Design a binder for this molecule. Sequence first.
Ligand SMILES: [Mg+2]
Ligand SMILES: [Mg+2]
Ligand SMILES: [Mg+2]
Ligand SMILES: [Mg+2]
Ligand SMILES: [Mg+2]
Ligand SMILES: [Mg+2]
Ligand SMILES: [Mg+2]
Ligand SMILES: [Mg+2]
Ligand SMILES: [Mg+2]
Ligand SMILES: [Mg+2]
Ligand SMILES: [Mg+2]
Ligand SMILES: [Mg+2]
Ligand SMILES: [Mg+2]
Ligand SMILES: [Mg+2]
Ligand SMILES: [Mg+2]
Ligand SMILES: [Mg+2]
Ligand SMILES: [Mg+2]
Ligand SMILES: [Mg+2]
Ligand SMILES: [Mg+2]
Ligand SMILES: [Mg+2]
Ligand SMILES: [Mg+2]
Ligand SMILES: [Mg+2]
Ligand SMILES: [Mg+2]
Ligand SMILES: [Mg+2]
Ligand SMILES: [Mg+2]
Ligand SMILES: [Mg+2]
Ligand SMILES: [Mg+2]
Ligand SMILES: [Mg+2]
Ligand SMILES: [Mg+2]
Ligand SMILES: [Mg+2]
Ligand SMILES: [Mg+2]
Ligand SMILES: [Mg+2]
Ligand SMILES: [Mg+2]
Ligand SMILES: [Mg+2]
Ligand SMILES: [Mg+2]
Ligand SMILES: [Mg+2]
Ligand SMILES: [Mg+2]
Ligand SMILES: [Mg+2]
Ligand SMILES: [Mg+2]
Ligand SMILES: [Mg+2]
Ligand SMILES: [Mg+2]
Ligand SMILES: [Mg+2]
Ligand SMILES: [Mg+2]
Ligand SMILES: [Mg+2]
Ligand SMILES: [Mg+2]
Ligand SMILES: [Mg+2]
Ligand SMILES: [Mg+2]
Ligand SMILES: [Mg+2]
Ligand SMILES: [Mg+2]
Ligand SMILES: [Mg+2]
Ligand SMILES: [Mg+2]
Ligand SMILES: [Zn+2]
Lengths: 114, 100, 151, 99, 127, 224, 211, 83
Amino acid sequence: ARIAGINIPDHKHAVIALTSIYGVGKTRSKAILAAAGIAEDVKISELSEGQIDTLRDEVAKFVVEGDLRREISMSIKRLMDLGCYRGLRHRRGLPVRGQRTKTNARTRKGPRKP
Amino acid sequence: AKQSMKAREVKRVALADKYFAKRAELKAIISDVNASDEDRWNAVLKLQTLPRDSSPSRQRNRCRQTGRPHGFLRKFGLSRIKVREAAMRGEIPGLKKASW
Amino acid sequence: PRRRVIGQRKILPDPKFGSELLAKFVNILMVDGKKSTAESIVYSALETLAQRSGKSELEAFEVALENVRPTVEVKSRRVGGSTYQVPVEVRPVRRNALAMRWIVEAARKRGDKSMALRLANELSDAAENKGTAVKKREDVHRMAEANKAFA
Amino acid sequence: QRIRIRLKAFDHRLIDQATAEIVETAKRTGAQVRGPIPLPTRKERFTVLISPHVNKDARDQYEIRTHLRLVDIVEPTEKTVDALMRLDLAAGVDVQISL
Amino acid sequence: NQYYGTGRRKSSAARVFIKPGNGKIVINQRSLEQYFGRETARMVVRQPLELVDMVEKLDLYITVKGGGISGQAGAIRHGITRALMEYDESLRSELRKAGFVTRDARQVERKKVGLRKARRRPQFSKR
Amino acid sequence: VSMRDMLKAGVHFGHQTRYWNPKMKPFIFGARNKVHIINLEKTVPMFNEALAELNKIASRKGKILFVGTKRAASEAVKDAALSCDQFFVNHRWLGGMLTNWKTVRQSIKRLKDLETQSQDGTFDKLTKKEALMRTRELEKLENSLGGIKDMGGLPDALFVIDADHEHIAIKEANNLGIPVFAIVDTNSDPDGVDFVIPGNDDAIRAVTLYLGAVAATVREGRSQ
Amino acid sequence: GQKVHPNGIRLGIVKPWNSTWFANTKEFADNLDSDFKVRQYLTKELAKASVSRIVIERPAKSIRVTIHTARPGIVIGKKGEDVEKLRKVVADIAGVPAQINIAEVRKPELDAKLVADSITSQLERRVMFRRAMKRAVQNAMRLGAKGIKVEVSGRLGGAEIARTEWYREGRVPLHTLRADIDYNTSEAHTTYGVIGVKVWIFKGEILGGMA
Amino acid sequence: PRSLKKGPFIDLHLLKKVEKAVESGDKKPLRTWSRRSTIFPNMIGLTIAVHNGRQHVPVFVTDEMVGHKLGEFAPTRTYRGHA
RNA sequence: CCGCACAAGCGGUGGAGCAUGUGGUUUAAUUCGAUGCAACGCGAAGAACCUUACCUGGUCUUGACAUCCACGGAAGUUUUCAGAGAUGAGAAUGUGCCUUCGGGAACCGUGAGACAGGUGCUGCAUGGCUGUCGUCAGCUCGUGUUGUGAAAUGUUGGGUUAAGUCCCGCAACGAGCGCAACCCUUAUCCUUUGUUGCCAGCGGUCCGGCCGGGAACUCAAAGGAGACUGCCAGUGAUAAACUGGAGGAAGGUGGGGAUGACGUCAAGUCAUCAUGGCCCUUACGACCAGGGCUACACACGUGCUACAAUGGCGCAUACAAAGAGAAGCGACCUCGCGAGAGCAAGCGGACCUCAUAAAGUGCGUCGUAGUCCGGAUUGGAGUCUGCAACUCGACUCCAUGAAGUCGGAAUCGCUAGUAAUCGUGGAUCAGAAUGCCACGGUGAAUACGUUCCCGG
Ligand SMILES: [Mg+2]
Ligand SMILES: [Mg+2]
Ligand SMILES: [Mg+2]
Ligand SMILES: [Mg+2]
Ligand SMILES: [Mg+2]
Ligand SMILES: [Mg+2]
Ligand SMILES: [Mg+2]
Ligand SMILES: [Mg+2]
Ligand SMILES: [Mg+2]
Ligand SMILES: [Mg+2]
Ligand SMILES: [Mg+2]
Ligand SMILES: [Mg+2]
Ligand SMILES: [Mg+2]
Ligand SMILES: [Mg+2]
Ligand SMILES: [Mg+2]
Ligand SMILES: [Mg+2]
Ligand SMILES: [Mg+2]
Ligand SMILES: [Mg+2]
Ligand SMILES: [Mg+2]
Ligand SMILES: [Mg+2]
Ligand SMILES: [Mg+2]
Ligand SMILES: [Mg+2]
Ligand SMILES: [Mg+2]
Ligand SMILES: [Mg+2]
Ligand SMILES: [Mg+2]
Ligand SMILES: [Mg+2]
Ligand SMILES: [Mg+2]
Ligand SMILES: [Mg+2]
Ligand SMILES: [Mg+2]
Ligand SMILES: [Mg+2]
Ligand SMILES: [Mg+2]
Ligand SMILES: [Mg+2]
Ligand SMILES: [Mg+2]
Ligand SMILES: [Mg+2]
Ligand SMILES: [Mg+2]
Ligand SMILES: [Mg+2]
Ligand SMILES: [Mg+2]
Ligand SMILES: [Mg+2]
Ligand SMILES: [Mg+2]
Ligand SMILES: [Mg+2]
Ligand SMILES: [Mg+2]
Ligand SMILES: [Mg+2]
Ligand SMILES: [Mg+2]
Ligand SMILES: [Mg+2]
Ligand SMILES: [Mg+2]
Ligand SMILES: [Mg+2]
Ligand SMILES: [Mg+2]
Ligand SMILES: [Mg+2]
Ligand SMILES: [Mg+2]
Ligand SMILES: [Mg+2]
Ligand SMILES: [Mg+2]
Ligand SMILES: [Zn+2]
């Protein structure tokens, strides 16, 4: 199976296989399956290619895969170009939502550099 | 605490219970469902026009006979230290050292 | 336990079968005070062990347990200002508890993508005198009587 | 129709005395009475730091116990409801009446 | 005709009414098998009957409130024991040998100031 | 008491020749079977002259303290004191019983307070465990001062059995000037006894003879 | 080692409260502030009248202050005038009809508060502290107290190293909750600082609870 | 976010003075202390000196910064690195 | 000789992410205090403004807060302009209350000095309060006695106890402060009263204790009973006590709490308060807006969530206790995927609301993988509180899916309804809990022993 999302979903159940697309979570996958009339626990096998098409045109109703990555990239550059506080924090690689930086801000900084 | 802090507290209490009705009606207009947009907008401006110290959220509970701003108890109106002092002297009715 | 050496508490007999030692077993592998889960795992494992054994669950469990019960173990002692690694013979309830603990630990570290399954697997293994629990009992005995000097 | 009286106190001997007096005047004045039938005692609790600075761990716990009593008279003859209001009792007892 | 017994565990309270005639057991308008979804509770609630060997001669009507499943099971066991004792008064010795008149006083210990639990002390460091 | 009266009771008996005290030589008849034999020829007149003094003291309203701490003879000495309405010490002697009189008076008062309190009441107010504990303390105080609760003040005369065993009592008495009447076995030091009776102090029969004769003469001195 | 307040630990066992009114959670703090102001005013205006205790009850819509004093005449004043003069201002402070009752302490040397304030008054008139201590203890023991402890602390005699000196006479069992121990403190403001006086007075164990 | 029920927030004095400036033509930068005011579209092309605790930083209002608050474009802390 | 001190055990911390405190560095400021155990989720039971003590700038000088004196005004209420705001400049009313009718009391403003004011220094001047050894069993005194005397004895010795607990011995005898007990709570029963709580037998039912009715039971809260080594056996000086047994709901101070001796550390707190001395007075005082206390190369401490199958997810379905509520808790109903919104009942509350407990159980699914584990981070879109969520709130939806696969040396807690695990509530609080303080559910393992470690 190759969805409009150029990746290749797994062989697992459909409701979780559709979450392999960058932009589809659990709720979006459930909504896609309900819009395509497909059960959630059906594997990616035993689905006629017509069903793969009637779910590809459904997932096409969301900005997922590459287009979403571009949207995230341009929205971050918006802040990095305006000069706002969030922009400077995105530039310096520091928590942008008001978390403490005295300790344990590692996921925005990486391993400790002594 | 300093006398100026208690003075600020009593002035805030007075300003908050002087403008209570006007603030109440302005906030009602603002949060009013299906209110006219112009009426809601002018009410926001009028609300921010009133004295800042008239909002009850700017009052800080202080111990009523020392003015301490921490360790306050609403049931007694006193900080923990003065609550303990009046409790051990038997000046708080019913209050006694508990164990269970 | 410095002044009065305190005795042991009395577990009441197992609900389903009636073995106080099975009650000690289900208490031993119980995690986070979750009794019912360990109880179900034990009951399921014993039934699976019984089908291959063709023997009553209590007896096959008993023969597997005695196959793991050690009789001597090492002890760190100080008598003459030395780190005495003395081999000493074990008490009955102590060797019962050690056998149960060892088989629970070996089961937990086997995995087998289940709990009752792996527990029954290694109980049937320790029944035929083979497995890590039996391996660890033999290793304890070896460590004990490799230093027979202090007897 | 009836008269329901709730008594609140901080000490239980005082409330027992008050409810005994109330029920006794009610029984004397011809009314029919229900007994004290104590409602659950509310014990409010506070814990305060006994140390002004540094020692948060050092602290003591206080509690106020408020005791409830409920007296119900089903035949409030005007011979009785007046004498009820005329009756005055100890200071530390709250009395609440309802018809 | 009826014989009553009250039993208590950690925070539970069970009223037990015994009468002769069958082996019916009702608990809070529900059968025993559909009120206690645990075999441990099922066997601990009928230990006194199996001990005194009166399992199918007594109809039990139970009402239990408070506590958890194990607490309610233990309270019902204590109540059945007391009701059995009011029924015959000569079963007392065997029931006491089994320890069903124990009424264990164990209760959840209170939390204390400075500790994280009844006895769990917070972690401590020196260096 | 006549020499024959003593001899049948065995007053002549004494301790071993291995264990004697030097000043007792005048009072010792001799030795037999390595046993010291006390001479009744000295014993009888000295006992009679002591009985004269005891009768005199009791006939001037004297308070008499019978003293003996032998586990065998405690009850004998207690009953001896009761038979003449006097005061006794039968339990182990307490140092400062006479010299530290004030402390004994506080203990006497505490014993009186506990017995008076039990009769008056308030034991119901006390917890059942507390009331039982108070009764145990009252029993302990009685086992300690049963004889001297009613002595009131320092006694006027002392009667001592086995003066060597009770040496603290005689030292106190001499320090107070209170006279000492004592049955003195051969192993004792007779310096502390102003009216000394040399005789056996262990044998129940001779001890009871001493006590009965003394008590008869004390009642006689009281009767007038 | 710190000691629990001997009065507060016996509240409801052998000792009663100094305020005995009832109030919900909306007029509780107001009542505490009101009777704190009342007690403050009464201690200020009656510092010479040897006031021992100020009990305050609040009936339905009134306030009743009982003043336990040792010199009732000074509190009342001639013709029964000063008592009314302070009653009206107590009614002003409390904002409610007021009543003033006066209970005489027949033996002042057995009251902890009176002994303590006497000691402090002697202290700030530069009397040697041990003299006042001993005199207070002996006066209390003479009038039938079964025990008394007096402790004066803080820069005694005007030194530079503060120290604490106490003196006990009799039996003062502090761990016995059944014991009736009157305890009070006071402070003397000498030219070298504040000096703290504490007095414990044991008056015999009470059998039968608060009754 | 404030709410969609209410409107975006702005300080009254700032509103009046920016409307005066936009009707009277471009002028010197408008000095303000209202870091908490939302930038409205009628303020584009202006230059506002927003306080930052000690000095008024001049921010030239662009089209893209509409909807944000003024305080977002005048940092208050100084870091410059730990060296 | 004792103590979770070790041992025997179980679960952690140390590794990861995050929360929080501290050090450090940075900064206009990152306010001050706490610093081995006994500082480091500490003062703070809750920093967006306020709080707030710090910083920048704008301002005031008898002052923000108190008394006094003089002069002029009723008080207050509704507006306009300028200003970021403090503050400045602007109108009609009011003319109340009391009068020997002057005026006063209330309040306002101005003027003049005494003064106010200080979270400024010293906790090595103090009170008060607290920590700590340590709930460790000790600390002493009177009298007596011994010795010229300093002193000793008591308090040592033999046993025993949780204990200077108790019994013998003994020149000691007693007592005081401690120990214990008195207090609270919990485990059984009895008595009394039965509502808003209860429902055994009764009748009536819409199958709902719901309604007649019942006072039995659960329960509620007052009173009382009960446990004393009392009884039996054995050991032991016939003592103290110990070991076992009977009865009993409970047995050996039943479980827990409160209660902390003389003193120790010039221990902590002059920033709760009080206070000696010193210091400031158009400022170290006072008002205002914005900022900071939330920084970030790092180090340490206490926590939370994890790494999964004894689990995750979906559906179904059981069983709590203890609390809070009037500017409050807020049902039902409708709207929204949701946080919530609209309407609005009841409840100062055994009644109404918060409020369906979650682990559990049943059924199905996932099949050991960085996964249907984990949830960080980040983007977008929202709700609510509040003048105001940029710095810097919580929560929701959609998307995103870091590290982490059980953690070196070392180290911590715990002896039973305990550890562990699971949820619930409360204080502070407009809003803001992984902290703190409480509540119940499920519910262990082990203790041979005192040789070692630490402390006494
Ligand atoms: Mg999501
Ligand atoms: Mg934050
Ligand atoms: Mg001040
Ligand atoms: Mg606030
Ligand atoms: Mg309530
Ligand atoms: Mg304390
Ligand atoms: Mg957002
Ligand atoms: Mg481990
Ligand atoms: Mg680290
Ligand atoms: Mg870590
Ligand atoms: Mg720093
Ligand atoms: Mg700091
Ligand atoms: Mg802590
Ligand atoms: Mg300035
Ligand atoms: Mg002026
Ligand atoms: Mg000054
Ligand atoms: Mg000063
Ligand atoms: Mg100090
Ligand atoms: Mg102890
Ligand atoms: Mg010590
Ligand atoms: Mg000792
Ligand atoms: Mg000593
Ligand atoms: Mg000595
Ligand atoms: Mg000894
Ligand atoms: Mg003692
Ligand atoms: Mg001794
Ligand atoms: Mg005690
Ligand atoms: Mg109860
Ligand atoms: Mg009814
Ligand atoms: Mg009761
Ligand atoms: Mg007992
Ligand atoms: Mg038994
Ligand atoms: Mg027994
Ligand atoms: Mg206990
Ligand atoms: Mg300290
Ligand atoms: Mg400010
Ligand atoms: Mg954890
Ligand atoms: Mg969890
Ligand atoms: Mg709340
Ligand atoms: Mg509901
Ligand atoms: Mg809906
Ligand atoms: Mg709502
Ligand atoms: Mg809630
Ligand atoms: Mg489940
Ligand atoms: Mg997940
Ligand atoms: Mg993933
Ligand atoms: Mg322990
Ligand atoms: Mg929890
Ligand atoms: Mg919580
Ligand atoms: Mg718990
Ligand atoms: Mg040592
Ligand atoms: Zn002899």
